[PDB]
Tab-separated table of N, CA and C and ligand atoms in Angstrom:
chain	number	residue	atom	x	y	z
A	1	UNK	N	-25.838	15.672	24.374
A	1	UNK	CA	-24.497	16.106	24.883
A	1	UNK	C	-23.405	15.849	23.825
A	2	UNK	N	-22.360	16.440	23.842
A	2	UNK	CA	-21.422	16.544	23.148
A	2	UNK	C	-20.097	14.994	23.033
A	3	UNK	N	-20.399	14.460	24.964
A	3	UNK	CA	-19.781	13.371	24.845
A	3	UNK	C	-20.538	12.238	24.712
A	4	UNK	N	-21.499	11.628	24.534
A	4	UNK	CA	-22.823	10.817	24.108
A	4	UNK	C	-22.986	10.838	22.519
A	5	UNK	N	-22.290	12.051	21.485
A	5	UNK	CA	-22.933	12.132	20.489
A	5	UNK	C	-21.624	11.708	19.505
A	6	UNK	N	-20.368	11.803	19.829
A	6	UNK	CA	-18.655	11.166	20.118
A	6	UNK	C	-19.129	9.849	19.774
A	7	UNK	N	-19.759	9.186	21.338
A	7	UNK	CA	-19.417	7.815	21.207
A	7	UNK	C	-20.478	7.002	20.320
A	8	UNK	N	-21.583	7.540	20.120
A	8	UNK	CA	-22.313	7.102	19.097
A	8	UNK	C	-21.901	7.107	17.560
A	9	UNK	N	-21.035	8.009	17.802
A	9	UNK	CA	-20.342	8.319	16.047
A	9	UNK	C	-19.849	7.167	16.168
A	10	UNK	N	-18.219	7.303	17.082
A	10	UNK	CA	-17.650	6.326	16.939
A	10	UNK	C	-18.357	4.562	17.244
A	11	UNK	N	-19.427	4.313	18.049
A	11	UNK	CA	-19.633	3.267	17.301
A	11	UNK	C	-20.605	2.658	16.325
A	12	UNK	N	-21.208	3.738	15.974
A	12	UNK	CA	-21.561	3.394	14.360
A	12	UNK	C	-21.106	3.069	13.370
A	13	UNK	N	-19.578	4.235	13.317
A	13	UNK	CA	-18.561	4.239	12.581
A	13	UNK	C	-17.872	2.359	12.138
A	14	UNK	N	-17.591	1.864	13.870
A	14	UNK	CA	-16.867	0.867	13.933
A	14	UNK	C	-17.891	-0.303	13.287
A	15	UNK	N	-19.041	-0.193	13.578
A	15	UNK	CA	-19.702	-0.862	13.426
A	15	UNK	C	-20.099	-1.121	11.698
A	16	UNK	N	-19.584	0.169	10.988
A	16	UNK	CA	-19.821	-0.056	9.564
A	16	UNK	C	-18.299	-0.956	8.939
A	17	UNK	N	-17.640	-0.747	9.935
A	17	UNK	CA	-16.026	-0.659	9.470
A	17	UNK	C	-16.060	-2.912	9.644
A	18	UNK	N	-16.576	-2.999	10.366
A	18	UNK	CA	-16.860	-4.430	10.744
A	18	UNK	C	-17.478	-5.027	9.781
A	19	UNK	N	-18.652	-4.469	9.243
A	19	UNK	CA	-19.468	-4.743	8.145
A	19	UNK	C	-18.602	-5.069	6.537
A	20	UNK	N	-18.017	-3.355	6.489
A	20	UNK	CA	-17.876	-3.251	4.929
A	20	UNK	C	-16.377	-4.523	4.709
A	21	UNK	N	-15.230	-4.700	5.862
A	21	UNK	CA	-14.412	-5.212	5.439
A	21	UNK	C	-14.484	-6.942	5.495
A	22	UNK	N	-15.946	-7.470	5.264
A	22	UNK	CA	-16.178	-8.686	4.850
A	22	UNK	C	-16.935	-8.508	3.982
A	23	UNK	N	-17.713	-7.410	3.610
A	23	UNK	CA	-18.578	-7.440	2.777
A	23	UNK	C	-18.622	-7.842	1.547
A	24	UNK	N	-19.192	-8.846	0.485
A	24	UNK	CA	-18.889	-9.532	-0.428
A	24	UNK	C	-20.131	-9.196	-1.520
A	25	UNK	N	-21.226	-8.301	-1.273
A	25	UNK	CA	-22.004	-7.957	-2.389
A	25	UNK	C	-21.767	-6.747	-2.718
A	26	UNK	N	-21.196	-6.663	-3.998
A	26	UNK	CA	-21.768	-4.992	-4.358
A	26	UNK	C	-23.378	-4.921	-4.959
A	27	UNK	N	-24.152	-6.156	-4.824
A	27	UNK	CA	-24.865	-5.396	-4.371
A	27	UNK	C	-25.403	-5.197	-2.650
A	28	UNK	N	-24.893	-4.032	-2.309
A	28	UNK	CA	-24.767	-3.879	-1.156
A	28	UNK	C	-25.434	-2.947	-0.854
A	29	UNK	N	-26.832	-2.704	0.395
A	29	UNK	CA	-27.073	-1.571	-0.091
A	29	UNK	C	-27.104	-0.693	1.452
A	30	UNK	N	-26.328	-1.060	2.131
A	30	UNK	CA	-26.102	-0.209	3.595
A	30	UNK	C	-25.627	1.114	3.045
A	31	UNK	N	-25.941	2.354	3.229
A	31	UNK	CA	-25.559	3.544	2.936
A	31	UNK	C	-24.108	3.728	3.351
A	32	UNK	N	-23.833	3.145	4.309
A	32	UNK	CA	-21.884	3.491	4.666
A	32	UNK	C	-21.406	2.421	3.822
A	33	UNK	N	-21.902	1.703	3.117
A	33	UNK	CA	-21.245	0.449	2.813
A	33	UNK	C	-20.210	0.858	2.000
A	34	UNK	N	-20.720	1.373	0.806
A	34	UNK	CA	-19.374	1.651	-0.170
A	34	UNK	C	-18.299	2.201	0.234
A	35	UNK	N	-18.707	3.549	0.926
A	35	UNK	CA	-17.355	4.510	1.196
A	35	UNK	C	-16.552	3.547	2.437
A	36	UNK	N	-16.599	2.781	3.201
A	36	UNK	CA	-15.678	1.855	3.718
A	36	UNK	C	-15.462	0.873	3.458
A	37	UNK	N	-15.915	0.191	2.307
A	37	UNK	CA	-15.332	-0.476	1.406
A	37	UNK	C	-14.212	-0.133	0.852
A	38	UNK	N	-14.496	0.999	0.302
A	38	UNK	CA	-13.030	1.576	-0.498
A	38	UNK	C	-12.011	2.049	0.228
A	39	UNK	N	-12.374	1.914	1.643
A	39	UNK	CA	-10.899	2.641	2.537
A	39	UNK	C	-10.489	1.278	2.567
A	40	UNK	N	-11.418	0.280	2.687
A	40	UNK	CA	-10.616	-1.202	3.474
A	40	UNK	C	-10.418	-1.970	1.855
A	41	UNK	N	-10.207	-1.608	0.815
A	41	UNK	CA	-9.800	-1.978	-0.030
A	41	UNK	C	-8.112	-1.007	-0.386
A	42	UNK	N	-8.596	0.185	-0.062
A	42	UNK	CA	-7.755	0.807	-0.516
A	42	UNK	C	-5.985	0.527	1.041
A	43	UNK	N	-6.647	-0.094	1.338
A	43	UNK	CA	-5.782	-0.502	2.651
A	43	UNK	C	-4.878	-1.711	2.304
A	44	UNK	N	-5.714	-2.738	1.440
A	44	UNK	CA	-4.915	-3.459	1.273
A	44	UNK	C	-3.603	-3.168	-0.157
A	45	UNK	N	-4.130	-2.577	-0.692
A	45	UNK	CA	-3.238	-1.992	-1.325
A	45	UNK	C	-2.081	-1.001	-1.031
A	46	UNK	N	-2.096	-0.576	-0.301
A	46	UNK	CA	-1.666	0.121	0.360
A	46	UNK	C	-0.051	-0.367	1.250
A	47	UNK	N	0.650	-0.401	0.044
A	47	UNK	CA	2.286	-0.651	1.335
A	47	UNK	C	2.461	0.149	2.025
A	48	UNK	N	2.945	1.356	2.499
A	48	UNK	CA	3.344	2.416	3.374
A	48	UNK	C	2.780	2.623	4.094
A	49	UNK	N	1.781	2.600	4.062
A	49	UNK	CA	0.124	2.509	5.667
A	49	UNK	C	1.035	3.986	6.612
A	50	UNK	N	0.961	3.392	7.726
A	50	UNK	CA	1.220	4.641	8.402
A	50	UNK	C	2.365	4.637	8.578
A	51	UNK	N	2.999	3.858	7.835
A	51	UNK	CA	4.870	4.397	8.351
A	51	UNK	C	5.002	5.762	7.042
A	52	UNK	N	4.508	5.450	6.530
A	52	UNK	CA	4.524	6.288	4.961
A	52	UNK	C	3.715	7.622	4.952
A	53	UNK	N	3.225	7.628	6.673
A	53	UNK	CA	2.259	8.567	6.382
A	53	UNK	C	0.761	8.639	5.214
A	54	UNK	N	0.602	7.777	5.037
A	54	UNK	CA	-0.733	7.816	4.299
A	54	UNK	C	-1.893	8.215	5.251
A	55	UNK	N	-2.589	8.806	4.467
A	55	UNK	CA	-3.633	9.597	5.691
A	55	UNK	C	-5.061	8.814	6.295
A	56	UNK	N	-5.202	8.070	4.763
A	56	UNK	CA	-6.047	6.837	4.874
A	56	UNK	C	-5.877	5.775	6.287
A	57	UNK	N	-4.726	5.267	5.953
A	57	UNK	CA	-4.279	4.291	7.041
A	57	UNK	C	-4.339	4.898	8.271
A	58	UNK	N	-3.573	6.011	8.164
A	58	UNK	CA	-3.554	6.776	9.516
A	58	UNK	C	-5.010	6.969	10.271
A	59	UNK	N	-6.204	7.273	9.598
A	59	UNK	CA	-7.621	7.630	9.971
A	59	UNK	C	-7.885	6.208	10.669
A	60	UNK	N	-7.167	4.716	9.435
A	60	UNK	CA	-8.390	4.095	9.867
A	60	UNK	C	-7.510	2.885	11.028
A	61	UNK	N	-6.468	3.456	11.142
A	61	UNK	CA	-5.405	2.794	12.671
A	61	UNK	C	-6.272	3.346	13.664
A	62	UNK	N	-6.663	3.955	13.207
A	62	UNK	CA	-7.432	4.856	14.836
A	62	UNK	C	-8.084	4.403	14.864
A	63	UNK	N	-8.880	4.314	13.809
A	63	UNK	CA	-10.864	3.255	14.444
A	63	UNK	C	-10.547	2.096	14.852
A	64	UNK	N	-9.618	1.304	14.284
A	64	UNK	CA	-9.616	-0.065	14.519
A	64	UNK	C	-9.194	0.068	15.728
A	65	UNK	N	-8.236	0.824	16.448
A	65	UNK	CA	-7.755	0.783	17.853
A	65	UNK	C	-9.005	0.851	18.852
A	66	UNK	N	-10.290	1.526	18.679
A	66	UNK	CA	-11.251	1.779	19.142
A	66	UNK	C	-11.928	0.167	19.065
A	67	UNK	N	-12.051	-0.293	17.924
A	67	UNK	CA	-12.544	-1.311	17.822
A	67	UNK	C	-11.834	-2.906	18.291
A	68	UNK	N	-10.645	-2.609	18.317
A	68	UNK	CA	-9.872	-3.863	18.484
A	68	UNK	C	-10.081	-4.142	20.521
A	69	UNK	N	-9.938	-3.315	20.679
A	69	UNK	CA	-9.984	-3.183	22.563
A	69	UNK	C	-11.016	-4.488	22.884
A	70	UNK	N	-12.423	-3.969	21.712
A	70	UNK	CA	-13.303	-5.190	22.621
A	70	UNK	C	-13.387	-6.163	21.090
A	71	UNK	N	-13.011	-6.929	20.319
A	71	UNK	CA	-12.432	-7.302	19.018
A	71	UNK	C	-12.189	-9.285	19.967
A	72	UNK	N	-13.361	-9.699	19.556
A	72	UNK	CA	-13.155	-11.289	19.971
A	72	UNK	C	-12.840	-12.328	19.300
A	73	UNK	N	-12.615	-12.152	17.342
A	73	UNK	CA	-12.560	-12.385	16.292
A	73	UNK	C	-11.244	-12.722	16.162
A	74	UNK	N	-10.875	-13.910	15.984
A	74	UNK	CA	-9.728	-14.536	16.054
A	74	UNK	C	-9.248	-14.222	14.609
A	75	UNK	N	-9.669	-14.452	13.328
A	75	UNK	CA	-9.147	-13.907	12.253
A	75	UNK	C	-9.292	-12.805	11.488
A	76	UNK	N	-10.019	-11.880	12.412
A	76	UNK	CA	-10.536	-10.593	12.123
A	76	UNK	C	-10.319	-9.940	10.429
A	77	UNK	N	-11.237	-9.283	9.651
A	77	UNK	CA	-10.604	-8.477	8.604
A	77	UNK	C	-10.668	-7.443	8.702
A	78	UNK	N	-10.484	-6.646	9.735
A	78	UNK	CA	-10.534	-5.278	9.874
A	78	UNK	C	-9.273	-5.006	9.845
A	79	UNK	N	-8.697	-4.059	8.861
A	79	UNK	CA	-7.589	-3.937	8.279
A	79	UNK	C	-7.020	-2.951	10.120
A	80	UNK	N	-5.760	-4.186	10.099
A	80	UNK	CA	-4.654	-3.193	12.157
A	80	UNK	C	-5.450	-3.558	12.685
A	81	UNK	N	-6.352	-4.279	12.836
A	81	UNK	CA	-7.127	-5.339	14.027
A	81	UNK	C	-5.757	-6.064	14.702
A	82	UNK	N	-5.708	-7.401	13.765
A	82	UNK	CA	-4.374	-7.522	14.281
A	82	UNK	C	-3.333	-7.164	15.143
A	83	UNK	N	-2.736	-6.012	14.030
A	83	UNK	CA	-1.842	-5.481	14.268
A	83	UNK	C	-1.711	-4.567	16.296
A	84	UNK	N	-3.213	-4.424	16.548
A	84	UNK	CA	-3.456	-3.554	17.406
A	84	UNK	C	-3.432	-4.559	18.643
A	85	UNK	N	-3.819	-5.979	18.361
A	85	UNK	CA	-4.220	-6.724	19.383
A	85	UNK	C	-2.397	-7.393	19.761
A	86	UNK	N	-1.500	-7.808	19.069
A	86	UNK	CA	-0.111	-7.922	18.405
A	86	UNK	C	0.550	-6.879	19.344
A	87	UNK	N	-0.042	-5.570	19.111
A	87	UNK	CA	1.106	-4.519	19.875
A	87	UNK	C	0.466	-4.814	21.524
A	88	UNK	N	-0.904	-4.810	21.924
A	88	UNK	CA	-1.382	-5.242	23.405
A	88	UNK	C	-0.549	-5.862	24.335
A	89	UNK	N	-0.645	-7.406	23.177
A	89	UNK	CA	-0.010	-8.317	23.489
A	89	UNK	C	1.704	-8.177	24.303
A	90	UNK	N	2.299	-7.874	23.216
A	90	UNK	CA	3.405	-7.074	23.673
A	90	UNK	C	3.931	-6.250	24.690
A	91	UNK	N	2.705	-5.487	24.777
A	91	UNK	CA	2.873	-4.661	25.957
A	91	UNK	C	2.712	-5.248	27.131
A	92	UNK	N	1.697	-6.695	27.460
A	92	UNK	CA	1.819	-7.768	27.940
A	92	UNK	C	3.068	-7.899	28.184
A	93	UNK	N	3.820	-8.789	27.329
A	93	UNK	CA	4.945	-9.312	27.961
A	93	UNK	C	6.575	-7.942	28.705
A	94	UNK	N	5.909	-7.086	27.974
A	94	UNK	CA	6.912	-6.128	28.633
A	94	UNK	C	6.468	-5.833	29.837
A	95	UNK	N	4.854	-5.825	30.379
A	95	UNK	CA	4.888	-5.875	31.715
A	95	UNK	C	5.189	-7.038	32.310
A	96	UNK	N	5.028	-8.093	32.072
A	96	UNK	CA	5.219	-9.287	33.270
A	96	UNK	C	7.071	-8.883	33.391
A	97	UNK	N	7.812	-8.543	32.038
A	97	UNK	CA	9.754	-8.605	32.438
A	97	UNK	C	9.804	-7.347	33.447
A	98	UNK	N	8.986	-6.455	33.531
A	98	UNK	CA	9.330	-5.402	34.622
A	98	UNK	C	8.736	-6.043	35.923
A	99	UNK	N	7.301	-6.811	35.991
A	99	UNK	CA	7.778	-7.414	36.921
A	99	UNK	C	8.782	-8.472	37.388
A	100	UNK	N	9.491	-8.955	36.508
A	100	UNK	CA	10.776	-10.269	37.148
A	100	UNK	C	11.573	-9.056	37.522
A	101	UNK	N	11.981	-8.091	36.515
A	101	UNK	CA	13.410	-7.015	36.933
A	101	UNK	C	13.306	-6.620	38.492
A	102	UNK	N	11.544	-6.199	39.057
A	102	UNK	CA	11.791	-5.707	40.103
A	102	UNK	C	12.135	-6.585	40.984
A	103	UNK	N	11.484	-8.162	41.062
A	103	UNK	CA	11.897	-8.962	41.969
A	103	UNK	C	13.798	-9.507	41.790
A	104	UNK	N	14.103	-9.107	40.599
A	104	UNK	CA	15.517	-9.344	40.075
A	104	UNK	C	16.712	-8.200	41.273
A	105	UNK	N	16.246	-6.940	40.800
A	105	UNK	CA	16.758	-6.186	41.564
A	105	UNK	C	16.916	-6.475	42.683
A	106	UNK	N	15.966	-6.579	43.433
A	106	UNK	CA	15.719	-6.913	45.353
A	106	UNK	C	16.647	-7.649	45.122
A	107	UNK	N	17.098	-8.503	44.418
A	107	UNK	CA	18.315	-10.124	44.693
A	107	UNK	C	19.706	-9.464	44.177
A	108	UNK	N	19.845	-8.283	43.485
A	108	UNK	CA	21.026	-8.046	42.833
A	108	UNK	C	22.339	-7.948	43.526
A	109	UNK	N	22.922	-7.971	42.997
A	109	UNK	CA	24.544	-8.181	43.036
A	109	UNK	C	25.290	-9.041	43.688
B	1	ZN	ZN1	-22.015	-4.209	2.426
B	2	ZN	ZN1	-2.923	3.862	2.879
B	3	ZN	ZN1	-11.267	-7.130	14.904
């Protein structure tokens, strides 16, 4: 099927992306190894990431968002791991203030 063959990409994909950005041998010899090596190298180099539109960053904000959801790795190196778990978070605390506002309201004026 078409949606079975999606999620296998994507977690193979994630699953190389986990690999290559600790990976410490060149000699390395996983077939995805190199080519995501060089995105998660080329990441850290990388100032402008996706505010800058870089297309790189932009591709690989997306996997990591896929990957960060279930991401238990407290110092993670998956380049917007972080960053993805950081914005969650956030969205966290903006829900608990909509809930005080609503109980705020009921009490207002
Ligand atoms: Zn490797
Ligand atoms: Zn970039
Ligand atoms: Zn992670």
């Amino acid at each position: 099927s078409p949606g079975d063959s999606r999620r296998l990409s994507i977690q193979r994909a994630i699953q190389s992306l986990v690999h290559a950005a600790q990976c410490r041998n060149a000699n390395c010899s996983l077939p995805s190894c190199q080519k995501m090596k060089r995105v998660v190298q080329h990441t850290k180099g990388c100032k402008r990431k996706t505010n800058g539109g870089c297309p790189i960053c932009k591709q690989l904000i997306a996997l990591a968002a896929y990957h960060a959801k279930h991401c238990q790795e407290n110092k993670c190196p998956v380049p917007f791991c972080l960053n993805i778990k950081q914005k969650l978070r956030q969205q966290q605390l903006q829900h608990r203030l909509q809930q005080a506002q609503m109980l705020r309201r009921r009490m207002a004026s």
